[PDB]
C-alpha cells in the first residue's frame, strides 16, 4: 500500500541545472558533506555517464522529489552502477522510491543496459522487494572531462599464521544486482 499519485518525471540534472541547488539540498540532507563537493559531483552529470537523474514533480517551481546517480561499469558495457538513491525526507513512504528505481530501469534499458548494480546495508530488503539479488562487486567509472587526452634447500619458515565488500568506514556491505 504505497501507491504514488503525483505526476512525476525523470530528468538529468545537467538538463535542468536551475534545480542543481535543490538537488544538492536533497542529498546533503541524507548524507551531509561539504556543499562544494556535492555541487561539483552534480556538476559532472553528462550524457557520457556519470549522470544524475532527478525525480521531479510539476507542482512555485518544480520539487526535486528524488535523485539517483548512474555510472558506467569497468569491463561491463551493459552494467550501470546505481548510487546515492534518495527521496526527499518529507516525501518518503509515498511510492516515490519505487518509481525512482523503476524509472531507472526503464531509462537504462532503453539505452541498451541490462544489469544494474548497487551497494547497501540497512536497505537490503528495499531492493530485494523490487527484484534485486545479491551479486559481486563492480568498479564504477568516474567522470573524466571531454577535453582530456582520452588515450589512456633449507625449509621454509611459517606462513603469516576482497576489500570490495567493505565501504568507506570498514563496514561490510551487500552488493546487489538486477537484470533488466
Amino acid at each position: 500500500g504505497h501507491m504514488s499519485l503525483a505526476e512525476l518525471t525523470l530528468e538529468p540534472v545537467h538538463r535542468r541545472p536551475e534545480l542543481l541547488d535543490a538537488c544538492a539540498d536533497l542529498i546533503n540532507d541524507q548524507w551531509p558533506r561539504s556543499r562544494t563537493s556535492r555541487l561539483h559531483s552534480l556538476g559532472q552529470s553528462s550524457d557520457a555517464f556519470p549522470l544524475c537523474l532527478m525525480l521531479l514533480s510539476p507542482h512555485a517551481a518544480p520539487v526535486v522529489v528524488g535523485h539517483a546517480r548512474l555510472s558506467r561499469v569497468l569491463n561491463q558495457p551493459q552494467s550501470l552502477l546505481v548510487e546515492t538513491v534518495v527521496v526527499a525526507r518529507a516525501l518518503r513512504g509515498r511510492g516515490f522510491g519505487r518509481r525512482l528505481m523503476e524509472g531507472l530501469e526503464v531509462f537504462a534499458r532503453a539505452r541498451g543496459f541490462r544489469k544494474l548494480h548497487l551497494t547497501t546495508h540497512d536497505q537490503v530488503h528495499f531492493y530485494t522487494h523490487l527484484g534485486y539479488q545479491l551479486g559481486e562487486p563492480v568498479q564504477g567509472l568516474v567522470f573524466t572531462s571531454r577535453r582530456l587526452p582520452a588515450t589512456l634447500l633449507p625449509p621454509p619458515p611459517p606462513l603469516p599464521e576482497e576489500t570490495q565488500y567493505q565501504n568507506v568506514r570498514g563496514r561490510p556491505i551487500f552488493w546487489m544486482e538486477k537484470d533488466i
Binding site: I27, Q30, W31, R33, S34, T36, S37, H40, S41, Q44, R69, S71, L74, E83, T84, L118, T119, T120, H121, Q139, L141, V142, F143, T144, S145, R146, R147, L148, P149, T151, L152, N167, V168, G170, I173
Partner: protein
C-alpha cells in the same frame, strides 16, 4: 549507498599552487605559494596566506615555503595546504582522497613528512604523491619520453619509461622564471631604467611574460637588434610611464641555454636534455628523442620549441628523429596530468589509505608512490 567523493589534485609549485578536482580539465584555483608577515607594524593576524598575502604585499614580507621545488618551511607549507582546502577550494580535506605532486628527486624525509602531515593534521581518507614531470607526460597523451619541466624555482630533465620516472637520469638546474625576471630587471636597469623593488619585480615579470622570446640564432638576432629597431617593443607601467625593450627580449630567456649570463657555470637545458637521454637505457633513447615534452610556465616563451629542436638536433646522432612537443596548455599540464592519473581506472589500487598509513607508518610512501 552514497557515491564516493571525487579526489582532489594539488600541484605545489615554488611560485604557484594549482588545486582542483580529479577529472576536470583545469584547476578551479591557482594562487601564489607565499606566506606574508608584517614588515614592522595587533595588525590583524600573525601571518597572511596566498591570495591574502598577495593583496596585502605592500605591508608584508613574503616567504616562499617551497624553494626550487623542495618544501623547506613546513609550518608555512602547512599554512598553504590549509588555505588550499578551506579558503581556495572550500572543501573538507577529511572527505576527499588527495593527490599531491612532488619535485623530481624529492628527498625521502620530505615525502615522509608530506604523508604524515596529510594523514595526521588534515585527516585525509587516502592520498597519493606523484612526480610533476610524469603528470606532464600523461597530459601530453604519453607514458614514455623525456620532460623539460621549468617553472619558477627549478628546471628538471625527467626521462620517463611507461609512466615511471628514471631517477638515475634526472637532471636538476637551479634556474627558472624567477631568475630570468631578476636577470631582466638587471639588464633593463643597465638600459637606463630602475627596477629594484619587489613590486617593480612583479612588473618586470609581466614584461618578461608578455614580450620575451627565444631567438633561433642568438648571435644573428643580436646583430639585427644592433642594426635596426624592428625587435624593440614598449610596455606601459601602471603609472603611465612607458619603457621600451630591445635585445633584452631574447637575451633574457637565452639564459636557459647559456646559464653563464646569470653567472652560473653549468650546462644549458639542451645539454642537460642530452645528458639525461644518454644516462638512460639504450633501447628507449629513440623514444626519448621523439617525445621531448615541455611543461612549466618558463617553457612558454615563443620560439623555445624550434630552438631546442635545433640544439638537440646538433647534439644528437645524424640519423635520430627528434620531436619537441610544446602543448599550448603547459602552464598547467602538471595539474592536468594529476587530474588524469587520479581519474584512471587503474588508480583506485594506488591510493595510500588512512589504514595503510596506520599499519605501515609514513615509510609507506616510499613503497607505493614512484
Amino acid at each position: 549507498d552514497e557515491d564516493e567523493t571525487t579526489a582532489l589534485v594539488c600541484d605545489n609549485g615554488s611560485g604557484l599552487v594549482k588545486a582542483g578536482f580529479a577529472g576536470d580539465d583545469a584547476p578551479r584555483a591557482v594562487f601564489p605559494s607565499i606566506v606574508g608577515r608584517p614588515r614592522h607594524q595587533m595588525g590583524q593576524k600573525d601571518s597572511y596566506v596566498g591570495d591574502e598575502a598577495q593583496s596585502k604585499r605592500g605591508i608584508l614580507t613574503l616567504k616562499y615555503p617551497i624553494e626550487h621545488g623542495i618544501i623547506t618551511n613546513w609550518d608555512d607549507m602547512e599554512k598553504i595546504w590549509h588555505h588550499t582546502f578551506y579558503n581556495e577550494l572550500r572543501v573538507a580535506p577529511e572527505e576527499h582522497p588527495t593527490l599531491l605532486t612532488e619535485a623530481p628527486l624529492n628527498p625521502k624525509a620530505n615525502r615522509e613528512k608530506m604523508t604524515q602531515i596529510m594523514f595526521e593534521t588534515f585527516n585525509v581518507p587516502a592520498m597519493y604523491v606523484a612526480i610533476q614531470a610524469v603528470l606532464s607526460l600523461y597530459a601530453s597523451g604519453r607514458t614514455t619520453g623525456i620532460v623539460l619541466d621549468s617553472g619558477d624555482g627549478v628546471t628538471h630533465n625527467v626521462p620517463i619509461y611507461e609512466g615511471y620516472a628514471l631517477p638515475h637520469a634526472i637532471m636538476r638546474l637551479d634556474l627558472a622564471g624567477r631568475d630570468l625576471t631578476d636577470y631582466l630587471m638587471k639588464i633593463l636597469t643597465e638600459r637606463g631604467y630602475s627596477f629594484v623593488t619587489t613590486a617593480e619585480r612583479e612588473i618586470v615579470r609581466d614584461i618578461k611574460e608578455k614580450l620575451c622570446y627565444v631567438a633561433l640564432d642568438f648571435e644573428n638576432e643580436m646583430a639585427t637588434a644592433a642594426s635596426s629597431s624592428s625587435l624593440e617593443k614598449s610596455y606601459e607601467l601602471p603609472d603611465g610611464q612607458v619603457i621600451t625593450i630591445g635585445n633584452e627580449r631574447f637575451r633574457c630567456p637565452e639564459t636557459l641555454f647559456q646559464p653563464s649570463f646569470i653567472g652560473m657555470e653549468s650546462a644549458g637545458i639542451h645539454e642537460t636534455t642530452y645528458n639525461s637521454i644518454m644516462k638512460c637505457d639504450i633501447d628507449i633513447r629513440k623514444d626519448l628523442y621523439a617525445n621531448n615534452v615541455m611543461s612549466g610556465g618558463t617553457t612558454m616563451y615563443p620560439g623555445i620549441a624550434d630552438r631546442m629542436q635545433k640544439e638537440i638536433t646538433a647534439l644528437a646522432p645524424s640519423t635520430m628523429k627528434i620531436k619537441i612537443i610544446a602543448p599550448p596548455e603547459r602552464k598547467y599540464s602538471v595539474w592536468i596530468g594529476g587530474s588524469i592519473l587520479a581519474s584512471l581506472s587503474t588508480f583506485q589500487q594506488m591510493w595510500i589509505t588512512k589504514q595503510e598509513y596506520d599499519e605501515a607508518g609514513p615509510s609507506i610512501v616510499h613503497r607505493k608512490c614512484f
